[PDB]
Amino acid sequence: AKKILVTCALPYANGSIHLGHMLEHIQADVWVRYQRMRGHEVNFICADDAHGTPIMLKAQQLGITPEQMIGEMSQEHQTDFAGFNISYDNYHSTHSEENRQLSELIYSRLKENGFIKNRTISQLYDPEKGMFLPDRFVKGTCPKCKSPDQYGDNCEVCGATYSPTELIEPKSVVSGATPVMRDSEHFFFDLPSFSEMLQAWTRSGALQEQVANKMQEWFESGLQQWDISRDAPYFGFEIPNAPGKYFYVWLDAPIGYMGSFKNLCDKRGDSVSFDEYWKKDSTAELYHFIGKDIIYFHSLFWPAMLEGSNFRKPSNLFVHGYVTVNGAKMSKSRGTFIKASTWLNHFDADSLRYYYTAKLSSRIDDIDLNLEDFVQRVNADIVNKVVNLASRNAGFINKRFDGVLASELADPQLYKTFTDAAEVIGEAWESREFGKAVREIMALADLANRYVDEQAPWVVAKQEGRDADLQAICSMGINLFRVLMTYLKPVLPKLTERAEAFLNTELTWDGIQQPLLGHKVNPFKALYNRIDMRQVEALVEASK
């Protein structure tokens, strides 16, 4: 049995969960649920990313403490993820004593080992508020086209890009005061010292080809020292021995993966597992599921931080693409920027889990939620292929055979075809070729429905003396449903629970080798109903 620690990226505390987050958390959860079904020790770890200047300022604007605000969003996030049945073993916060201690420990080791440099930089500063301004908190007039009210390093009228120091008549977004350049000592992590180590990691063949290609572009451009400090006022962790200095959010954020695991171990009273998973000699596996917009932090800064502080590095990074809706980036004006909470007012979680899983692969390409296709595919595949095998057969079993399945399989060869597919389907789940697994499963579902059509139970049922034939056919279909629901158990947790209640059995991966014979099943109300485009139209309207 493997020991596996899996994470998803830590959601920003000052935004609601949306369908882009859900792609990542669903992808990870399907993989995690499969690994648990194969008997491994799995720890699925996440947390909110709760630090930084935007959070500090938003809390001030709301007139509440940052602690109050992040606490409220953590609850909102966890409610949403729970509604999608994301099966975390722990959901913590980067704003935690565990992450503080681990961030201070890693920093102190990096510093003792020679990987922290001090250098003075010059940055725009709001003298009224009394704070350095990140680029997006500076506004002014575009130096090229003279358009007013442009933010940060780019103009949304003419498209020009420039340093915010080039803005005409610059203003602080916080106070309206004119910012000035001010010097400040910053601490830098010496990423370039890890170049050779990181290049060897890139060539090993573990990472997604597309990610390794991006890494080569970054090595070509040249690694640079990384500014990991921010001046007060800040919401984050203060740097030991450096009054008025804080760790930049992105330094402490991946350490939050460790902090969340430490929290889980401590709450369990488990004094051994943290070191078993994070020491350099670990035999446990560590996987980060992440989006393509945060590769650099996880593939360059993070392994180097771990190496330099005497911890193990990730076994793999699993990177996915962006979510599009109807082929395009999510659009507020079109109602396609869809929150996870809004989704659940209109559809169940299983429908989206299924749709994403059917499109996902081991590559980093974007995943398109085409809403018309969503309706067609859920109805065709879930209602009419898989659930149909239960719904078309269970009525006869319950009404004419007292709920009892036949004592033998009607078509043992066909059953073996279904169980023989377990190796390829499981390999597809394992390798993250989710679309391939779904295609195989639905090909089997087509065979199962062809079997039932060939036996014509709606004819057999009306013909005198054919009761045994009817029970045989319907029991065979139910056993095929049992197998397909096992293969789909990582994908469709709630439907699976309903299937298990109907079948009077928990679905295990190995259990498919023992069909249900001479076995009582239960009645059920609709296992899964059809959806329609009116519901899609309502979702879109509700999201505008």
Look up residue 417 and give its two tokens. Answer: 């075809």
Among positions 236-265, residues that touch ligand B3M (CB under 6 A) are 253-254
Q: In what order do the strands lie in the sheet with 328-329?
A: 328-329, 323-325, 367-369
- Residue 10's binding partner out of Zn ion, ligand B3M, none, with CB under 5 to 8 Å set by partner kind: ligand B3M
Q: Which stretch binds ligand B3M (CB under 6 A): 9-17, 145-153, 344-352, 388-396?
A: 9-17
Q: Annotation-wise, does 46 bind a ligand?
A: no
Q: Is 10 in the site for ligand B3M (CB under 6 A)?
A: yes
Q: Which of 201, 199, 311 is nearest to 257 (CA)?
A: 311
The size of the chain, in residues, is 544
Q: In what order do the strands lie in the sheet with 285-291?
A: 90-93, 41-48, 3-8, 285-291, 316-320
136 DSSP assignment: G
CA distances from 396 to 35, 428, 462, 495 (A): 36, 35, 11, 21
Question: Least separation, in Å, of the C-beta of 152 and Zn ion?
Answer: 12
Structural contact between residues 96 and 45, judged by C-beta atoms closer than 8 angstroms: no
- Tokens 């590559």 belong to residue: 363
Q: Annotation-wise, does 474 bind a ligand?
A: no
The smaller minimum CB distance to ligand B3M, of residues 258 and 445, is found at 258
Q: Which stretch binds ligand B3M (CB under 6 A): 6-14, 141-149, 348-356, 531-539?
A: 6-14
Q: Is 444 in the site for ligand B3M (CB under 6 A)?
A: no
Q: Is 37 in the site for Zn ion (CB under 5 A)?
A: no
Q: Which stretch binds ligand B3M (CB under 6 A): 5-13, 127-135, 142-150, 323-331?
A: 5-13
Question: Least separation, in Å, of the C-beta of 142 and Zn ion?
Answer: 3
Question: Least separation, in Å, of the C-beta of 3 and Zn ion?
Answer: 54
Q: Is 49 in the site for ligand B3M (CB under 6 A)?
A: yes
Q: Annotation-wise, does 8 bind a ligand?
A: no
Question: Least separation, in Å, of the C-beta of 20 and ligand B3M?
Answer: 10
Q: Annotation-wise, does 332 bind a ligand?
A: yes
Helix boundaries (H) for 282-327: 295-296, 302-308
Question: Least separation, in Å, of the C-beta of 49 and ligand B3M?
Answer: 3
Contacts of residue 522, defined as CB under 8 A and 6 or more positions apart, other chains included, come to 398, 403, 501, 502, 503, 504
Q: Is 287 in the site for ligand B3M (CB under 6 A)?
A: no
Q: Is 9 in the site for ligand B3M (CB under 6 A)?
A: yes
Structural contact between residues 490 and 33, judged by C-beta atoms closer than 8 angstroms: yes
356 DSSP assignment: H
Look up residue 353 and give its two tokens. Answer: 């889990």
3-state SS of 183-250 is: EEEEEEECHHHHHHHHHHHHHCCCCCHHHHHHHHHHHHHCCCCEECEEECCCCCCECCCCCCEEECHH
Question: Least separation, in Å, of the C-beta of 322 and ligand B3M?
Answer: 12
Size of the site for ligand B3M (CB under 6 A): 7
Among positions 131-190, residues that touch Zn ion (CB under 5 A) are 142, 144-145, 147, 155, 157-158, 160
Q: Is 24 in the site for ligand B3M (CB under 6 A)?
A: no
Q: Which of 433, 318, 418 is nearest to 9 (CA)?
A: 318
- Binding-site members for ATP are 332
- Binding-site members for Zn(2+) are 142, 145, 155, 158
Give residues in contact with ligand B3M (CB under 6 A). Answer: 9-10, 12, 49, 253-254, 294
- Binding-site members are 142, 145, 155, 158, 332
